[PDB]
Paper text:
The [name] AcrAB-TolC drug efflux pump contains the inner membrane H+/drug antiporter [name] comprising three functionally interdependent protomers, cycling consecutively through the loose (L), tight (T) and open (O) state during cooperative catalysis. [name] is the homotrimeric IM proton-motive force-driven H+/drug antiporter component which recognizes and actively transports multiple drugs (antibiotics, detergents, dyes, and solvents) via the tightly connected AcrA and TolC channels across the OM, leading to an observable resistance phenotype. Four different entry channels (CH1–CH4) have been described with putative entrances from the periplasm or the outer leaflet of the IM toward the two drug-binding pockets, the access pocket (AP) and deep binding pocket (DBP) inside the [name] pump. Here, we present 13 X-ray structures of [name] in intermediate states of the transport cycle.
In an attempt to prevent ansamycin binding, we made the switch loop more rigid by Gly619 and/or Gly621 to Pro substitutions. We assume that the Gly619Pro and Gly621Pro substitutions induce a switch loop conformation mimicking a transition state during wild-type L to T conformer conversion while the HMW drug is bound to the AP.
Numbering used by the authors:
A (entry chain A): 98 to 241
B (entry chain B): 1 to 1033
C (entry chain A): 290 to 337
D (entry chain C): 50 to 97
E (entry chain C): 866 to 913
F (entry chain D): 11 to 166
Amino acid sequence: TDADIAQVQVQNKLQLAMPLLPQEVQQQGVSVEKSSSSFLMVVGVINTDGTMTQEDISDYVAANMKDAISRTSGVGDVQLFGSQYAMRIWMNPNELNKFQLTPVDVITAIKAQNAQVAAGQLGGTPPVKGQQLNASIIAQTRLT
Amino acid sequence: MPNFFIDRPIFAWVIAIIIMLAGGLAILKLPVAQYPTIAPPAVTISASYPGADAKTVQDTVTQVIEQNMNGIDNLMYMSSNSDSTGTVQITLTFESGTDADIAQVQVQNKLQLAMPLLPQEVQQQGVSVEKSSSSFLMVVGVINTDGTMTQEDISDYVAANMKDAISRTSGVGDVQLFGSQYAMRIWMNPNELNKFQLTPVDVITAIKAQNAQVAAGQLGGTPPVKGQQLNASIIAQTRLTSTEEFGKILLKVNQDGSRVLLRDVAKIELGGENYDIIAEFNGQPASGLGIKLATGANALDTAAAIRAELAKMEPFFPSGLKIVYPYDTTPFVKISIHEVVKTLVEAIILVFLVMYLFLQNFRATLIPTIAVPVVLLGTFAVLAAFGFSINTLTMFGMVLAIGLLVDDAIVVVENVERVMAEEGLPPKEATRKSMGQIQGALVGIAMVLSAVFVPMAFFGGSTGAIYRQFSITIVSAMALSVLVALILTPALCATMLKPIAKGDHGEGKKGFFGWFNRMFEKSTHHYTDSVGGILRSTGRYLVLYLIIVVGMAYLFVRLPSSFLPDEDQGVFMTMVQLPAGATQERTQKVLNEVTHYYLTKEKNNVESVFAVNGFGFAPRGQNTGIAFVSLKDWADRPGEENKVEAITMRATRAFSQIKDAMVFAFNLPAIVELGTATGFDFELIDQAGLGHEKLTQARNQLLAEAAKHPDMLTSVRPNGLEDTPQFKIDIDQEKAQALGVSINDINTTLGAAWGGSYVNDFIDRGRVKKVYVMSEAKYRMLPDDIGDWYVRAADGQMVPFSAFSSSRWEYGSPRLERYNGLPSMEILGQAAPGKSTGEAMELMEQLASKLPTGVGYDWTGMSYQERLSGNQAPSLYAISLIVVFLCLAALYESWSIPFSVMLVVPLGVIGALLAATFRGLTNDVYFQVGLLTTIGLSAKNAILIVEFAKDLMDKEGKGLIEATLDAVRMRLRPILMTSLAFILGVMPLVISTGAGSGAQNAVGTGVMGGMVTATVLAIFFVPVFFVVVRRRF
Amino acid sequence: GIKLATGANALDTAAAIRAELAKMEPFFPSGLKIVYPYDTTPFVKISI
Amino acid sequence: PGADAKTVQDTVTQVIEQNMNGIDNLMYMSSNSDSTGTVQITLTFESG
Amino acid sequence: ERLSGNQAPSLYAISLIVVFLCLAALYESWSIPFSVMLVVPLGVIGAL
Amino acid sequence: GSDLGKKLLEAARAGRDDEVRILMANGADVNAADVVGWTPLHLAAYWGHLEIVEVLLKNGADVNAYDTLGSTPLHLAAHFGHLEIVEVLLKNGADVNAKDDNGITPLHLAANRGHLEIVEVLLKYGADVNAQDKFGKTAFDISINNGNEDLAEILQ
Ligand SMILES: CCCCCCCCCCCCCCCCCCCC(=O)O[C@H](COC(=O)CCCCCCCCCCCCCC)COP(=O)(O)OCCN
Ligand SMILES: CCCCCCCCCCCCO[C@@H]1O[C@H](CO)[C@@H](O[C@H]2O[C@H](CO)[C@@H](O)[C@H](O)[C@H]2O)[C@H](O)[C@H]1O
Ligand SMILES: CCCCCCCCCCCCO[C@@H]1O[C@H](CO)[C@@H](O[C@H]2O[C@H](CO)[C@@H](O)[C@H](O)[C@H]2O)[C@H](O)[C@H]1O
Ligand SMILES: CN(C)c1ccc(O)c2c1C[C@H]1C[C@H]3[C@H](N(C)C)C(O)=C(C(N)=O)C(=O)[C@@]3(O)C(O)=C1C2=O
Ligand SMILES: CCCCCCCCCC(=O)OC[C@H](CO)OC(=O)CCCCCCCCC
Ligand SMILES: CCCCCCCCCCCCCCCCCC
Ligand SMILES: CCCCCCCCCCCCCCC
Ligand SMILES: CCCCCCCCCCCCCCC
Ligand SMILES: CCCCCCCCCC[N+](C)(C)[O-]
Ligand SMILES: CCCCCCCCCC
Ligand SMILES: CCCCCCCCCC
Ligand SMILES: CCCCCCCCCC
Ligand SMILES: CCCCCC
Ligand SMILES: CCCCCC
Ligand SMILES: CCCCCC
Ligand SMILES: [Cl-]
């Protein structure tokens, strides 16, 4: 069986199911892969000077190394032995209740104040007659 | 095998007939295009984020898609651009030989599962995955001459009435609209919105409610009450269809009872989906269709079919609408076929005249006139079997092989005529003996030429695919030439030729031929006397050979290297680049001046100017433009003064006077994907999250160092754009919450007004089209206009933007580049005059190694091709030489004698180099393939001389010099006949100054010069080589 | 943890992985080092 | 769902069919736009 | 059905020519093949 | 403007000391402004080109030149953490309490990015610590909101 056509046929059917799946599952990213069940190799990464922790090395591999290896021809699947960094907001229920707030309010505020806004241009097309200024309008950007 | 077919001429005829029918069928059915598929397979991912800046596009779209392009097969590299027009283009380039359909579907499938991660605005617009292709068959311009239509009106008409019908035309692959179908444009007024306490949020909400398709159900649907008589579908709310309906969209009902409609707060019209591009054709508004040829289709049939469809659309056009053809390749391809068919016909006529001049019987002149067409036809059947097309490269590949085809015909027939004249044998017995002398050599030649040309097919990348076109074409024609020479030609000779009495060399005739035969027989004695003198003093000719070899090596190094010669194709582009922040109106004034020039000062040359404002070479924006010039017929432009090169240099010089703009004209390349010979393509990479500003500093550091080496590097610049001043506005979160104003309402109001918002779809005359809400131009021009926009608070009060916002000027990128998922900056440049591409690249690497920590680099495009193409050459040259030697060793049964043949190579190369150098031409592929065919024919001439000489020594027991003199005597006439015919055959190609002359000159010049020296020197030097080699070993 | 794509060559893919890792090594933060704790390909090369 | 044949044809069928250019060995194309809200565009290709 | 009927004449023409040429090559003759190929109508009428 | 005015704006931004030198000798307009109202001194201050800032001030560049949104070169230098340029501009008579259209001062911008050395230099040249922006916010109100406890102590 041509593995290319097998993958193509499987995904054509998966795409009919995708809309019916929960929004949380879609946002985690569904993956269709054609690979062996066993490992070809394990590429281990360490810090000999002991300057970087297990989490620091895991983030570096994920952020700088993994993507290029995943795109390499013949690499069917790549498994990170660790986790990429995320902005972790560890909520306190005692402090949330104190100010009469919930996780719903925390999530709403992050979506609102961690936003990348498309705000158009000064002197954008179609413009008026005799326009001299053309500049991108920069509003809210992602927090860093 | 020749003996077999001498006794069986009908069988020989049956094979020739079958070959001609297969070839005759091939000619009818073979695809036709200008060039074949050369570039490696590339897939482009295009997305639009309306009103988004470069960083917004990159950090929400580009990076998300890039991170998800995993588990795809045969990916070489990935590159992307994110610009301030709200556009992202990610290009994935694949290994040469990859199935482009499988490449696309794999990319497309990985994007599909990454779509839920993209912004809802980008998901709504869509993300196109297409196979990257630059080559258009033709560009159909659609204009309005009576000034009753805008470019938006014409674009909508073409989309609705023309595009689909052109897409269904026979041989048409893809069709690109130069514009968009209408969009329902709601131009909002902030003064009117604030007056009724409304915002863009309310306008979008109302349109979504009052322009929608609502599912109802059925009367008497299943399961029903038994006895039900009727079952009908219930139709509820359907989409709005007109500007009138959109204007009557209810927004608000006032306290008194008066109604606020959408037409009260906004101007409503059918307009363009976007207004970035302004297209003009000789000043008049214009749209158009960019048409590509389908796979395995005929360019000439497709172009005829396209014009046939447009012809029967003519009667239904609105008043003023006119079709124009600013770009069409088929008139150029029509000439290319005619000129190649002409060359082949003239070559057959020239052979006929030469054959009659020497042999002086019409029966002899027929055998080549039959054999050569049979080989040519057979070649087409083999191209079709390989899945090749009738294209510029394959056509000139057969022109370059004419010399080899013609020689096979002459060599077989001439040798029979001699044997009959020298011995008085009857045609059939003479043919048997004649073939007996050459049949072993002809097979040896077939293997030697295979050893030369076949390895040329095994180069990788773009240049390898080009060389593969010439390789298979020449090898196929050569292979069939030898089969026809071993099967048909001997059978024709034995049956058609007239017997010659022994000793009859035609010296006893009267008139021209009596004189000629006596002149030539006397000249043959002068030649053998001269060789006798040369072979008494070989030492001085060995010295002269080393002068030629040194002179060759010197001229090779001096000759500038190119890919394909630039042609006058009746069109050329003019670039218009204004400084940073320059508006669309300023760019139009420069374009209007550029157009006015071409229609005034080049009115006898220029037919039309296609001025496109908002689109450059690589970049987009209001400060970029391009003027595609279309010239009159070649016949109306006589002399070099009225050609693209002369006009280009004239226009560029005239436009250097233009202020606050960088303008210049230039000719189109033969094939865009190759770039320039000596030109390199460098990528500077952020390898440790340094950021944009630090990669810019590192780029400036590299560019400055490159400027200190003008001896090696020339015009080393960035391919991208510089940082521009951008209007940063900060929303005060505390003030918004204090006033009871939601951030969604603020960012929607700003985004929808200033950037534009794609709300939903409506149906215009039975066609689904987009609905856009945006600010009427005058209220979104300047920073002071920010305060004119009001957002409604929770308590109902209208709050101006100034109350909860603060702004400042800062610098940011209007175009962010990435390479293999990392931030990058593309640097273009070329090797300085006299320097190789390799040397220039080595310095850039040396300069790159001295840049700040975390700044890497990589080679892309032609530079990626050049490296992997250069690493193979030594191996492919070695294999060729080794197999040539081994083949000659088997033929001559000698490890030493093969050297006497292989020493001929420089004799043909020096003549090609002198001709190319003198005429001021380059070391292009046509010249390079020309060298191999020149080397090939001279090698064949030497093989038959050495074979005759060796056989005389072995069979008749003659001495070394006696055999050598008797050999070159017998071989003089056939060598001169081929040379005389072939040199005259390529004379029209050399002197050609018409359309496609650039390629003709490149093919002709190098071949003529090479043949002249190859012929003159070899007849004197091959005798020396054989004697010297035989004496030594 | 790398897994071989269906019908792909183990040695060619392993060589292509090492070639890509070689491009990353020079821009490593101080101390960071690649180790090879598990590889099935050395056996195939050596055994042949 | 809920759209009549005409609505289905204008919003779906013609949007898909106008993009079915530049496909190899395509003999003919047939489609049905129905009251059920359903589209079925069948592309028949050359033998082989 | 249309395709089948349209291509049948050319199939007969090429078929007759291939048999003729095959006989001409085998028997080293133009007379034997032509003498043989004249028989075809005697068969075809019986089939009709 | 003029032809040389454009080249000085480009050279000042790019950090080309040699080109600025030749342009000052040839008499390139130091008061040349782009469409947003940025002088060569604005650009030199923004990108942190110390020598060009000094050369421009020697050749009579307006130290208190403001853009179309009322921001000065000291605003730019203070915001992007260019300590040496802030000192040079203040020695050549840059308004330490210069307010943009938003009521923002060089102290506000320095406090926002946590440029402690620059904040101290501004206070040394008499930066109004009680100066409020359009939202009634001081440099101290920014430090407590940003959570910069080192900066908050300096501003008392
Ligand atoms: C839709 C389908 C598309 C296809 C298009 C149609 C193409 C059709 C082509 C196929 C038919 C082949 C043509 C046959 C021609 C034969 C000529 C016969 C001559 C003749 O009668 O004289 C013979 C003797 O002459 C001799 O001995 C003759 C010797 C020299 C050969 C004659 C020249 C042949 C030229 C070939 C035709 C080229 C056409 C190019 C396509 C007598 O016969 P005999 O048996 O008594 O002779 C003794 C044998 N020992
Ligand atoms: C031993 C006896 C054998 C019998 C044949 C004798 C051959 C010589 C005489 C033939 C009679 C005709 O004579 C012939 O006239 C023609 C026409 O002017 C000449 O014409 C030819 O030669 C002249 C030079 O002389 C060339 O410039 C010209 O291109 C060529 O056509 C011949 O040179 C001449 O030989
Ligand atoms: C760079 C461009 C020029 C390169 C061209 C080279 C090949 C074409 C020129 C052919 C010249 C051959 O011409 C031939 O030269 C040799 C020289 O060895 C002469 O030979 C002469 O010298 C030799 C050696 O001492 C004597 O043995 C001989 O008796 C005497 O005639 C021939 O009489 C002459 O017919
Ligand atoms: C560059 N290109 C070949 C031309 C030439 C002349 C033109 O007159 C035009 C183009 C590009 C096309 C692209 C189209 C694109 N699309 C196919 C609708 C498009 O989405 C955009 C866009 N910026 O998103 C256009 O500008 C565009 O509407 C446009 O205005 C064009 C246009 O008017
Ligand atoms: C009789 C022996 C002939 C040996 C030469 C064979 C060369 C074939 C090399 C090859 O396969 O590639 C062809 C190449 C494609 O880029 O085209 C070429 O570059 C043309 C080669 C011209 C010069 C040949 C060397 C003679 C110098 C002394
Ligand atoms: C009978 C003549 C035909 C022979 C031609 C076949 C040659 C095939 C070319 C093989 C390519 C080898 C490339 C090696 C590159 C390794 C780089 C060190
Ligand atoms: C590709 C070139 C290979 C050349 C191989 C060398 C051949 C040496 C010739 C020796 C001849 C032996 C003479 C008889 C003793
Ligand atoms: C690349 C490997 C093959 C090279 C060609 C081999 C040539 C063999 C020459 C042998 C000469 C033997 C001389 C006998 C005295
Ligand atoms: C395999 C390399 C090509 C060598 C061809 C030489 C063929 C010589 C045949 C000589 N012959 C037997 C006909 O006399
Ligand atoms: C119209 C298509 C058939 C003719 C094409 C020309 C082929 C000539 C190639 C030498
Ligand atoms: C010394 C010069 C002699 C030239 C002899 C060459 C004659 C060749 C004519 C075909
Ligand atoms: C290509 C045609 C071959 C059919 C005839 C068989 C030839 C045998 C003659 C001895
Ligand atoms: C010796 C027979 C050769 C003919 C086959 C094509
Ligand atoms: C060009 C495709 C068909 C070839 C016939 C063998
Ligand atoms: C001996 C007859 C040769 C057959 C060629 C097909
Ligand atoms: Cl950054």
